[PDB]
Ligand binder design. Structure first.
Ligand SMILES: Cc1ncc(C)n2nc(CCc3nc(N4CC[C@H](C)C4)nn3C)nc12
Ligand SMILES: [Mg+2]
Ligand SMILES: [Zn+2]
Length: 312
C-alpha cells in the first residue's frame, strides 16, 4: 500500500519538537499526511477523503501574515511531536482528532482578535459572545466535514463520531488564550495536590487544552531565527488591528500600537514570563517527555534578554 516518505533530512528532523515545515507550501499537505500515517496509522482515514479535506481546509485559510495555512500545519507538527513522545497516553480517537483539530484550529481567521470583532460589532460577535473566532473555527471545521467526499470520519460509529467532534470542539475552544490562564492554574494545582487523574475525562480535557496552547505557541520553541522571524508576522497582524482600532477612534493596547515598535523585546519578555514559560513548565510536569519545548522556550527567552542588553 501507499505511504508517504520524506527526504532523509525531513524524515529525521520532523520527529524533533523544533522542526520548521519550511517555505515550500506544496509539501505541507504531504508533511501532514506523513504525520497522520505515523501518529495514527495508514488505516485512520481514506486517503482520497483526507487529501480532499486537507485541500478544502487549506482553501479556507486566508492570506494573512500569521494566522494562515503555514501556522495551521506548524501547530499540527508540534501536536505530532507531543503524541509520538507520549505514545501510549492517548486513545485511538484522540490521535485521530487532535491533528485534525490543529489543522482546523484557526480556519477562516481574518487576522483580528475576538476583542476587535466585539468593538467593530462584526456579526460573529453577535452569534458567539465568547471565544468568538474559536467558535467560528469549529463551525468552519464542521462545514468542511459535511461537504461531499470530505467525511474522513465516515468509518466511525455514531458515538465514536460524536466523541471525536467533541474532542475537536474542546481542543479548538482551548486555543482561546483568554481561557489558557485559568486552565493552566487548575492544572498546576491538581498536579501539586497530586489529585491529577488522566482517567477523569474533565482532566484529560484540561491536559489536551494545555497541549493545544503549547502547539499554538510553538513559535517560541523553535531555532532562534524562526522565532525572531515569526515574531515579525505576529506583530504585523497586531499592528494592522491597532490601525483598525484607531479607525474606530479607540487607542489600541500597547501590544497592537506600531508606534511602540521599539518596546517589542520587552513585550516578548513579559510574554515568555506571563504566558509561554508557565505553559511549557506545567506541560513538562504533566508530560515529562515534552521537556525539549520548555528548554527551547528558555533558550529563546535568553535570546530576547540579549536583544535588550544590545548583545543582539
Ligand atoms: C510569540 C507570540 N506568540 C503568540 C502570541 C499570542 N503572542 N503575543 C505576542 C505579543 C507579545 C507582547 N508584546 C507586547 N508589547 C509589544 C511592545 C508593546 C509595549 C507591548 N506586549 N505583549 C504581551 N507575542 C506572541
Ligand atoms: Mg486562534
Ligand atoms: Zn493558532
Amino acid at each position: 500500500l501507499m505511504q508517504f516518505t520524506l527526504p532523509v533530512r525531513l524524515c529525521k528532523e520532523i520527529e524533533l519538537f523544533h522542526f520548521d515545515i519550511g517555505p515550500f507550501e506544496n509539501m505541507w499537505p504531504g508533511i501532514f499526511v506523513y504525520m497522520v500515517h505515523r501518529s495514527c496509522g495508514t488505516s485512520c482515514f481514506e486517503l482520497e477523503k483526507l487529501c480532499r479535506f486537507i485541500m478544502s481546509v487549506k482553501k479556507n485559510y486566508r492570506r494573512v501574515p500569521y494566522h494562515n495555512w503555514k501556522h495551521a500545519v506548524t501547530v499540527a507538527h508540534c501536536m505530532y511531536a507531543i503524541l509520538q513522545n507520549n505514545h501510549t497516553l492517548f486513545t485511538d480517537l484522540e490521535r485521530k482528532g487532535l491533528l485534525i483539530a490543529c489543522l482546523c484550529h484557526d480556519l477562516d481567521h481574518r487576522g483580528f482578535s475576538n476583542s476587535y470583532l466585539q468593538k467593530f460589532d462584526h456579526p460573529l460577535a453577535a452569534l458567539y459572545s465568547t471565544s468568538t473566532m474559536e467558535q467560528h473555527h469549529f463551525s468552519q471545521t464542521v462545514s468542511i466535514l459535511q461537504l461531499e467526499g470530505h467525511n474522513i470520519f465516515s468509518t466511525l460509529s455514531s458515538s465514536e463520531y460524536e466523541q471525536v467532534l467533541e474532542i475537536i470542539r474542546k481542543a479548538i475552544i482551548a486555543t482561546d488564550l483568554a481561557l489558557y490562564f485559568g486552565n493552566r492554574k487548575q492544572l498546576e494545582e491538581m498536579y501539586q495536590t497530586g489529585s491529577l487523574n488522566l482517567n477523569n475525562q474533565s482532566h484529560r480535557d484540561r491536559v489536551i487544552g494545555l497541549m493545544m496552547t503549547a502547539c499554538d505557541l510553538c513559535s517560541v520553541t523553535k531555532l532562534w531565527p524562526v522565532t525572531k522571524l515569526t515574531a515579525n508576522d505576529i506583530y504585523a497582524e497586531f499592528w494592522a488591528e491597532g490601525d483598525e482600532m484607531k479607525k474606530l477612534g479607540i487607542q489600541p493596547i500597547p501590544m497592537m500600537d506600531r508606534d511602540k515598535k521599539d518596546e517589542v523585546p520587552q513585550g516578548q519578555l513579559g510574554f515568555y514570563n506571563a504566558v509561554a514559560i508557565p505553559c511549557y513548565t506545567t506541560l513538562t510536569q504533566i508530560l515529562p517527555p515534552t521537556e525539549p519545548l520548555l528548554k527551547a522556550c528558555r533558550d529563546n527567552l535568553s535570546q530576547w534578554e540579549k536583544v535588550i542588553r544590545g548583545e543582539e
